[PDB]
Design a protein around this ligand. Structure first.
Ligand SMILES: [C]C1=C([C])[C]=C2C(=[C]1)N([C][C]([O])[C]([O])[C]([O])[C]OP([O])(=O)OP([O])(=O)O[C][C]1O[C](N3[C]=NC4=C3N=[C]N=C4[N])[C]([O])[C]1[O])C1=NC(=O)[N]C(=O)C1=N2C(=O)[C][C]C1=[C][C]=C(Br)[C]=[C]1
Ligand code: ZN
Ligand code: ZN
Ligand code: ZN
Length: 751
C-alpha cells in the first residue's frame, strides 16, 4: 500500500496535513497515510480515522451508522464520512471575549461549544470557567487563511448551523436546505413569546404576504451584494435567517455582531467565516431597514453602521411619517440629518387630538390595515402599546331608525363586487389610452345588468348599494368618476399585509413623536427652493433662511408637488411631472363628537362602528360610518367620515353647520330615542390645509401604478423622494409612507 504526506486535493495550501480526528489507534497524526481526506485547506483526516467510522468491523461504526440514519431521514444532504466529520468530530473555534484581544482559538476536541462559552471565553482558559499572558500568543496560522475568498472555494461542504434560533420557525423545511444541521435534535424538535404579528418567513409554496422572506431562496438584491453565494446559498441563508429570528425575538435593542456570535454554533474553521460574514450581512440588512429599525434609538458612538457610511449630510423636507422614518434611519446610521417642516408641528397627516377625556382621537390617520409584518405593529411592540382589532359587525342604520336586515347588506355588497369583477374583466385587454373612469364603467355595467335581468330592487336595497359605493369612494379618496378603471386597485398585484385590521387606540402620534425624539427638526420652516446645481444642495425657506447638504430628501404631499410649491433648480423632468400629475390627490374629512353618555349602547350593543344608509344619492358619503372611539366601552366619543361628493358639500359649510348636519343625522339614526347634545367636537379641514391639501393618493383615469415608481426615482443620486404617493406596493398609508422613508434612507446610505 502506497502512502502520501500531501493532501488528496490538487492545489490545497496545507503543506503538512495533520489529522484533526485522531479517532483510530493507528491515526497517521501528521505523517503518511493512504489518503489525506480534505475538508478545508486547514482541516484534514487520515484514512485510518476514515475507516475507523466507515468500515463495519471498526470501533467507530455504530456511531457513524446511528448518525447516518438520523441524517438521511431528517435532511436532503448525502451522508458521508466527510459530512459526519464536519458535523460531529471537527474541533470548535472560539474568539477571546477580551475586547482588546478577540483572537481565534481552537478548543480541545471533546469541548462542545455553547453560547455560554462563546460569551465567556478568554485565551488559555479552561472552557466553562487571571493574567493576559495567553492573549499575546499568536493565532494559529490557519485562522488568517479563512478571510480569503479562495479559502471558501476550497471548502468542500457548506457549513450547517446547530441550535439556530430560526429553527423553531422553519420546521416545514428540510434543515439543510436552510443551512441547519439535520442531526440537531433541537432544530428537529407559535414561537413562545414572539409577537404574533411577526411572521418573517414564508411557509413552503406560500406567497402573497407582505414583507415575508423565503428562508430557502436568496433575493436578487442579496445575490447582487453577495454573489459568492449564487451557486450554493446554504451558508448565507442560515445567517440571514438567524439574524431575522434574533431581531424579532428582541426588537427593543440594536442587534449587533457580538450578540449574534454566540448563536452561531458550527464546528471547524468555517465558523470563523460564518462570524465574519454575519457581520457583513447584518450591516446590509440594517441599511435596508430589515432589522434594527422602527423607533429604536442609539446614543452617540453607538451608530448602527460602520464609520464608512457616516460621511454624508442630508436635508429632509417634511416631518410626516416618511420624513421622520428617513431621519430616524439616517440618524441611527450615523449620518447628519436636518428636517425642515413647514407647519408648527410634526406628524403631517398624523395629527392626534388629546383633549377628549379618556381617549385619543386622530384628526388624520388612526387605522392599521394588516398587522402581520407591518412596521407599525413592530413599533407598537417596541413602545409597549396595544392596537384594537376591529370586530366584523356593522349594522346599517337607516334615517328613521330602522336597522337594515343583514341579508340586504350582504346581497347588495354581493351585487356591487360583481360589478367590480366585470370591470376587472373588461380592463384585461385595455391600454392606458383606452382607460375609462371607474364610476362611469360601474354605472354602465349596472344599467346593462338591470336592463338585461329585469330585476327590481326596493328603495332600501338601492340606498344600501349607494352605501357600498360610498365605501369604495372612501377607499379611493374620490368620487369614482376621477378614478382609473384600469388601475384603481393596481397595488393588489403585489403581496399585501396580512392579518388584523386595527384601530391604533393610542394614536399614530405616539409613534411619530418617538421617531422624532432628539432629531434636529426645524418647525415653521417651509421650503421654497431646492437648488442642486452646485457641489452641495442649497435649500431656502420662505423667509430666506438657507440650508445646505450633500443630499436632499423631499417627502411633501402629492398635492404640493402638483402645485409646484417648491421650485427645483434644475427643474423636475417632464417624465416626473407627468407621473406626479397622473395620480389624484384623494381627500376625506373627519368629525369627532363627545357626548355626556354612550347614548348608542342599547341599539349598537358594543359593535366598533355602525353604518348610515344614505337617504339619497345627493347624501352619499356624508357620515357613512360612525366609529365608537373607546374599545373599552367607557367613554362617549364618536368619529365619522366625510367622503366622495360629500367633501365638496362641506367645503362651504362652517364647523357649526357641519356639526348641525351630523347631529341631525344622528337624531334620524336614533329616531326612536333621545340623543344628547355633544359637548366637544372637531371638524377637519385637510383639503384646505396649505401644506397638505389632501388625505391620500389614487390613480386617475389614464394613469398607471408605475407613476409611484417614477416619483420615487432619485435625481442624480442627489435629490430623493419619499411619501405615500411614492410607494407603489403600499400607497396611501402611514405604513407605506414609513417604508418609503426607510427605502430612501437605504438608497442614501449606500453612497
Ligand atoms: C388626512 C388623513 C385622514 C383624514 C385619514 C386617514 C389618512 C389621512 N391616512 C393617510 C396617511 O395619514 C398618510 O398617507 C401619511 O400620513 C402620509 O405620510 P407622508 O407621505 O410622510 O406625508 P405627510 O404625513 O402628509 O407629511 C408631509 C409633511 O411635509 C410637510 N411639507 C409640505 N410642504 C412642505 C413641507 N415641509 C416643508 N416645506 C414644504 N414646502 C407637511 O407639512 C407635512 O408635515 C390614513 N393612513 C393610514 O395608514 N391609516 C388611516 O387610518 C388613514 N386615514 C384613514 O382614516 C383611512 C385611510 C386609509 C386606510 C387604510 C388604507 Br389600506 C388606505 C387608506
Ligand atoms: Zn487520523
Ligand atoms: Zn487539503
Ligand atoms: Zn485573548
Amino acid at each position: 500500500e502506497k502512502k502520501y504526506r500531501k493532501c488528496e486535493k490538487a492545489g490545497c495550501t496545507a503543506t503538512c496535513p495533520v489529522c484533526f480526528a485522531s479517532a483510530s489507534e493507528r491515526c497517521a497524526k501528521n505523517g503518511y497515510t493512504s489518503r489525506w481526506y480534505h475538508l478545508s485547506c486547514g482541516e484534514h483526516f487520515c484514512n485510518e480515522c476514515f475507516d475507523h467510522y466507515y468500515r463495519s468491523h471498526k470501533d467507530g461504526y455504530d456511531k457513524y451508522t446511528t448518525w447516518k440514519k438520523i441524517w438521511t431521514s431528517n435532511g436532503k444532504t448525502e451522508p458521508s464520512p466527510k459530512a459526519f466529520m464536519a458535523d460531529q468530530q471537527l474541533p470548535y473555534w472560539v474568539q477571546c471575549t477580551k475586547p482588546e484581544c478577540r483572537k481565534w482559538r481552537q478548543l480541545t476536541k471533546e469541548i462542545q461549544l455553547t453560547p455560554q462559552i462563546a460569551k465567556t471565553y478568554r485565551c488559555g482558559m479552561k472552557p466553562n470557567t487571571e493574567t493576559s499572558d495567553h492573549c499575546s500568543l499568536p493565532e494559529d496560522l490557519r485562522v488568517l487563511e479563512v478571510s480569503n475568498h479562495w479559502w471558501y472555494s476550497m471548502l468542500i461542504l457548506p457549513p450547517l448551523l446547530k441550535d439556530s434560533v430560526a429553527a423553531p420557525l422553519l420546521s416545514a423545511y428540510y434543515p439543510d436546505c436552510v443551512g441547519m444541521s439535520p442531526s440537531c435534535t433541537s432544530t428537529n424538535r407559535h414561537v413562545p413569546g414572539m409577537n404574533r404579528y411577526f411572521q418573517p418567513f414564508y411557509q413552503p409554496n406560500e406567497c402573497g404576504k407582505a414583507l415575508c422572506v423565503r428562508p430557502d431562496v436568496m433575493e436578487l438584491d442579496e445575490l447582487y451584494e453577495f454573489p459568492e453565494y449564487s451557486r450554493d446559498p446554504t451558508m448565507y441563508l442560515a445567517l440571514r435567517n438567524l439574524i431575522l429570528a434574533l431581531w424579532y425575538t428582541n426588537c427593543k435593542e440594536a442587534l449587533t455582531p457580538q450578540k449574534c456570535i454566540p448563536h452561531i454554533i458550527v464546528r471547524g474553521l468555517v465558523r470563523i467565516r460564518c462570524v465574519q460574514e454575519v457581520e457583513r450581512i447584518l450591516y446590509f440588512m440594517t441599511r435596508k431597514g430589515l432589522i434594527n429599525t422602527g423607533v429604536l434609538s442609539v446614543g452617540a458612538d453607538q451608530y448602527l453602521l460602520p464609520k464608512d457610511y457616516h460621511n454624508k449630510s442630508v436635508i429632509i423636507i417634511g416631518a410626516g411619517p416618511a420624513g421622520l422614518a428617513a431621519a430616524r434611519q439616517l440618524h441611527n446610521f450615523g449620518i447628519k440629518v436636518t428636517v425642515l417642516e413647514a407647519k408648527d408641528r410634526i406628524g403631517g397627516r398624523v395629527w392626534d387630538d388629546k383633549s377628549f377625556k379618556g381617549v385619543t382621537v386622530g384628526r388624520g390617520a388612526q387605522i392599521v390595515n394588516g398587522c402581520i409584518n407591518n412596521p407599525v405593529a413592530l413599533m407598537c411592540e417596541q413602545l409597549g402599546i396595544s392596537m384594537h382589532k376591529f370586530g366584523e359587525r356593522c349594522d346599517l342604520i337607516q334615517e328613521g331608525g330602522r336597522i337594515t336586515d343583514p341579508t340586504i347588506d350582504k346581497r347588495m355588497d354581493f351585487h356591487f363586487n360583481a360589478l367590480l369583477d366585470v370591470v376587472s374583466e373588461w380592463r384585461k385587454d385595455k391600454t392606458q389610452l383606452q382607460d375609462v373612469p371607474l364610476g362611469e364603467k360601474i354605472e354602465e355595467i349596472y344599467k346593462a345588468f338591470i336592463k338585461e335581468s329585469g330585476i327590481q330592487f326596493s328603495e332600501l336595497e338601492g340606498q344600501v348599494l349607494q352605501f357600498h359605493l360610498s365605501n369604495l369612494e372612501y377607499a379611493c379618496g374620490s368620487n369614482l368618476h376621477q378614478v382609473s378603471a384600469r388601475s384603481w386597485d393596481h397595488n393588489e398585484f403585489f403581496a399585501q399585509f396580512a392579518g388584523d385590521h386595527t384601530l391604533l387606540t393610542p394614536g399614530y402620534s405616539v409613534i411619530i413623536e418617538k421617531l422624532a425624539e432628539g432629531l434636529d427638526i426645524q418647525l415653521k420652516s417651509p421650503v421654497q427652493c431646492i437648488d442642486y446645481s452646485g457641489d452641495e444642495v442649497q435649500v431656502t425657506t420662505t423667509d430666506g433662511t438657507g440650508y445646505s447638504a450633500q443630499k436632499v430628501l423631499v417627502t411633501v404631499p402629492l398635492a404640493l408637488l402638483q402645485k409646484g410649491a417648491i421650485q427645483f433648480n434644475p427643474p423636475l423632468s417632464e417624465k416626473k411631472m407627468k407621473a406626479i400629475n397622473s395620480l389624484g390627490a384623494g381627500i376625506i374629512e373627519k368629525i369627532a363628537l363627545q357626548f355626556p353618555y354612550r347614548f348608542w349602547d342599547s341599539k349598537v350593543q358594543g359593535a366598533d362602528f355602525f353604518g348610515h344608509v344614505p337617504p339619497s344619492a345627493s347624501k352619499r358619503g356624508l357620515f357613512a360610518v360612525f366609529y365608537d372611539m373607546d374599545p373599552q366601552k367607557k367613554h362617549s366619543v364618536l368619529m365619522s367620515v366625510i367622503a366622495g361628493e360629500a367633501v365638496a358639500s362641506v367645503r362651504t359649510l362652517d364647523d357649526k353647520q357641519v356639526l348641525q348636519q351630523c347631529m341631525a343625522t344622528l337624531r334620524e339614526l336614533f329616531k326612536e330615542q333621545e340623543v344628547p347634545d355633544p359637548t366637544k367636537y372637531f371638524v377637519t379641514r385637510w383639503s384646505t390645509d396649505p401644506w397638505i391639501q389632501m388625505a391620500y393618493s389614487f390613480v386617475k383615469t389614464g394613469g398607471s401604478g408605475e407613476a409611484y415608481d417614477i416619483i420615487a426615482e432619485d435625481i442624480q443620486g442627489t435629490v430623493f423622494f419619499a411619501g405615500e404617493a411614492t410607494n407603489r406596493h403600499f400607497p396611501q398609508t402611514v405604513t407605506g409612507a414609513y417604508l418609503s422613508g426607510v427605502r430612501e434612507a437605504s438608497k442614501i446610505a449606500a453612497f
